[PDB]
Amino acid sequence: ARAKAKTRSSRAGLQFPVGRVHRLLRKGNYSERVGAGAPVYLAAVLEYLTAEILELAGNAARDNKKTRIIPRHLQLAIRNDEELNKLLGRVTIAQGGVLPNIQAVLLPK
Amino acid sequence: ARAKAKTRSSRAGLQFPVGRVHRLLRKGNYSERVGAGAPVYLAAVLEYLTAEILELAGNAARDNKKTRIIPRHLQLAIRNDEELNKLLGRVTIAQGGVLPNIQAVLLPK
Amino acid sequence: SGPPVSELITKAVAASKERSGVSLAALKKALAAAGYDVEKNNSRIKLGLKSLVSKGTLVQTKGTGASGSFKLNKK
Amino acid sequence: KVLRDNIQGITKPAIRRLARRGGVKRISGLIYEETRGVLKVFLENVIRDAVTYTEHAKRKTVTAMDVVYALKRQGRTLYGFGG
Amino acid sequence: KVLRDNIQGITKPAIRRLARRGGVKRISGLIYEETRGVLKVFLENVIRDAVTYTEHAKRKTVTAMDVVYALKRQGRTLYGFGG
Amino acid sequence: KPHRYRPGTVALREIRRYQKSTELLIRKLPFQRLVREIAQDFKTDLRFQSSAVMALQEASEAYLVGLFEDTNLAAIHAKRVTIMPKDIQLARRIRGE
Amino acid sequence: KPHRYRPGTVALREIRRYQKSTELLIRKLPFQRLVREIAQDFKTDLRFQSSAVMALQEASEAYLVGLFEDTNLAAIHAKRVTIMPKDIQLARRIRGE
Amino acid sequence: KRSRKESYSVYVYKVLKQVHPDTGISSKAMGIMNSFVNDIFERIAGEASRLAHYNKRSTITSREIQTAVRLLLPGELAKHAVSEGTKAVTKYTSA
Amino acid sequence: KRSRKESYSVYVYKVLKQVHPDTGISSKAMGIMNSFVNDIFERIAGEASRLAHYNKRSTITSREIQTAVRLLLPGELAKHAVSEGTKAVTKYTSA
DNA sequence: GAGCATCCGGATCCCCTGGAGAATCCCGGTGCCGAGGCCGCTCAATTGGTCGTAGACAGCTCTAGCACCGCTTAAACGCACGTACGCGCTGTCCCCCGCGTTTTAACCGCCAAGGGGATTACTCCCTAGTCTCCAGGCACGTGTCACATATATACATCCTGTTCCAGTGCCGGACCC
DNA sequence: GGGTCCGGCACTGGAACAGGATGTATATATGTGACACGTGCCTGGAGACTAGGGAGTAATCCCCTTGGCGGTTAAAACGCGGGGGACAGCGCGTACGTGCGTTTAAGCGGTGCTAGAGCTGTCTACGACCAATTGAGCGGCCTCGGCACCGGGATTCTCCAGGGGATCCGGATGCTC
């Protein structure tokens, strides 16, 4: 008599695992309990952030004539957007490197 | 009928309330489950830090020949020790001021 | 044609004749005021001043090379 | 109620006195507008954090606890206001 | 078995190429030992934290998890080795 | 002729005086008015308790004074005694903001 | 007469070369020996995952390269292109270290 | 067999399918994105715990998640995250 | 009618009288110290919470408190702190 | 008739451009190995019912915060004299990139052997929970002495006069032609 | 007897030392209010017992880590050379420093009002927990085409070897004495 097992990400219209986030906050020990809307909200914001990052990453991959994204492309993505730069200023991508940046005094006349 | 009341700080021989910090760790949700010796240990650590910073402040106040601690004394105490400086680098004390720091190029001759 | 720079520099050092020598900046501004392209002739004024001090017609007060202050001879 | 031009309300000699606190020997006159700008930026950031803290609490008055709390999350911690 | 001089193992052109990655054009001679020293300080500060993590783990092997974890605590969290 | 000290010596005496001093250094009311002035823009009708205003006062003074030892290091670095706005700007840049 | 480029032109070319690159710069075996050496003075008989010492390695050039644009800004601040350890000391002092 | 390692890989892959149907992703960057999800997750979770404690609230609600999303994310990211998350929770309450 | 607010005032006063019988304090520096105890407590306790969640231990132990103290406190403070703490916990277990 | 002023043309040096080489960019080519997808499994998500409990709201008090007002100067500000740097430029010395050759140990790859990572089974030490009890810490009241403030001396310090030492330019003498 | 070269002296610039003004430090008097001590209380800490589970420890294996050995060469190391800066000095222009006066608005003291902070009581919405069960999520595995490496040809960058313009220098010319 139980209803058909559908997923909470599907009723949320989202693709990130909402139930897994709910579980990880439940055992993360950040409060004694969590409301229903909070893991949905956090899965939503994580999905938007990952969509932004990989949209810029795919555009950078098409920039480099490549259909496969390298962490170098993640550097070209995040380090060329100042708002994401403020989001992730203190982090470093392994095997990523730095953007090409030359000070104006360095080039010859 | 029942045992005579004796606080656990006294049985430890320590001054900060081990029961209070134990309760505060219980309601901070920093763990589900809390061991017995950890609040005693934490209390002893905080007593040593307070003891050293107050003896530094007391020698600073005796240097300034004032009997009572002013936050200027506390700033001079916390900043004249390199190791507490490493422990408390990114903090400023209210009404603290700063250490006497004048660079040699600023001095005449 | 036009007179070369050396006569202009002799007039520049004779224009003020204060107790110390005339400086490089003062002679450049004197050439600018009298009328000269000082912008593209820095190597020119350097070689000219070195050439004239090598003859002894003008003597160096304090500096070394092109730096310092410049004043005319004993006579 | 309306305030418009209190960004110049911090005086030039006040910035000189903070420079004396910082150990500045000679201060340029061109410094003052950019110090006012970075001062306004830092205050804008911290009170943005503070007003989000208080509108979480459904309060129309901000407290000193919220101030030291916002400065705690920025990495410029202060002490002595109930923190 | 024991090791005494591995700070010379971080060689001169490698430091040079790192300075190219930093965009540095020309590098003086006195640079090299200073970079060796600050490298030594940063490495010892992180590896002490890591070995305390392993001693908490009761584990005689340094794992990538505790390296990422200690760099996270030291404010320099690293992407690409978690998990 | 009336007495006059040479430049910097009065400034250095001010350094010793004010760095020895511990009191609040900026004027209270105009800074408080400025905090309100910035405050209307994000949320209307915000009210302040006074101790919060002194806390913001000390926070602003601390952030500024730290930037000024930073720019003093920069001015010594460029062999100067004057700071210029690029000194402050590069202090901001190396601090990572 | 063999060709010889003016100095810095080559240097700018390998700046562009490794800066568009993404690969490792420091040799992994002498550095890994250094990691065992610095681990040795605290506890004996330590073992290292290869990925662990690699991750510590990109952490190493990460901190080093970040300190290097810090010192590069410090060096161009003083109207110079030559780097000196006094710039490194400046960068460490502003960084809080 | 073995005990499992929980991950966020195929979710990043299917979001890639949503935003860019043609391109691919390397395993190294995939581990980077698992680290990214864990890092932003723990930051938002920690700020949620602080905002819960600070009002003496012991329930994680959607509201302080909204405040912390505003608080950590700068500007445009924050406002678009609020819009998209409110859209998501309105669909969630509507089953 | 008021609500009592918890603090650590008399305990720091007792510590002062143990280290200096004849010295006083200001109330402002007293607020500095109460906030100091709270802040250092929050740092150490947050480190302990992280160390608990890392190795899948649901119980905070004095051992990982010791690791956290050796972690956050550099140099000489760590070895002193572990010294009084070990003798203190042995005194606690002895009575 | 020749000494000097002037003009004009030729050597020379700096700037200004074309060509050779070379490092990288771009176009094929090949075989390879990470990746994407099938498949099997199994575990955490889901439903649903209950149970407790916690925050949202209504209402009521009361507190300091906002507003207004009147003196009262400390400071904000402006201006002017003045001195102390910022930096522009160049001279000079020197230190470090660049390119080549020789060396060397790094990388790879190939193979052996075992140390502890990690997982499982067990059984037990330890600690939340709860009821009850009672005493230390905090609101509250008060009293009181170190400290803020004011006032009278004393000394450092900092700039300046004054006084002596050194450079130097001009004047006097001596030599040489 | 003139021209030139050298030495001295007095005038001026630049250091050593005493002296006055002043700000800063020190000594002494005075009230005050914040530090400190005593009281009431009541809640937060503690003693005992119980349940239950997280975790310490034996065992095992395996696999991933460490040790060793041969080959190649890319990278390190060293040397020559040459060139680009580092930096000191000097000077000039300027840009604040500071010291006077002036305006004012911050600061202080006093008062009314209120709106929100905050505390208490309701109670309803909502989240936690748990039996049962399933479908998505991950390990394993297997193929393949995007891609890393390899090679060949253009293009752009660099640097250096020839031409043009400005300049300086020397010779011709006229003029005037």
Residue numbers in the entry:
A (entry chain c), B (entry chain g): 10 to 118
C (entry chain u): 35 to 109
D (entry chain b), E (entry chain f): 20 to 102
F (entry chain a), G (entry chain e): 37 to 133
H (entry chain d), I (entry chain h): 30 to 124
What does the paper behind this entry write?
Here, we report cryo-EM structures of human H1-containing tetranucleosome arrays with four physiologically relevant NRLs. The structures show a zig-zag arrangement of nucleosomes, with nucleosomes 1 and 3 forming a stack. H1 binding to stacked nucleosomes depends on the NRL, whereas H1 always binds to the non-stacked nucleosomes 2 and 4. H1 contacts DNA with L1, the amino-terminal part of α2 together with L3, and α3 to stabilize the nucleosome and contribute to chromatin compaction.
The H1 histone is present on nucleosome 2 in all four structures, and is also observed on nucleosome 4 in all cases where this nucleosome is structurally resolved. In all ten focused-refined maps, H1 shows three DNA contacts, similar to what has been described. The H1 loop L3 and the N-terminal part of helix α2 contact nucleosomal DNA near the dyad, helix α3 binds one linker DNA and loop L1 contacts the other linker DNA. H1 that is bound to nucleosome 1 always contacts entering linker DNA via its helix α3, whereas H1 on nucleosome 3 uses α3 to contact exiting linker DNA. In nucleosomes 2 and 4, the entering linker DNA is in contact with α3. We found low Δβ values at nucleosome 2 and Δβ values of less than 6° at nucleosome 4, where H1 was always observed. Stacking of nucleosomes 1 and 3 is apparently stabilized by H1 binding to nucleosome 2, because a published structure of a 3×177 trinucleosome array lacking H1 adopts a non-stacked, extended conformation.
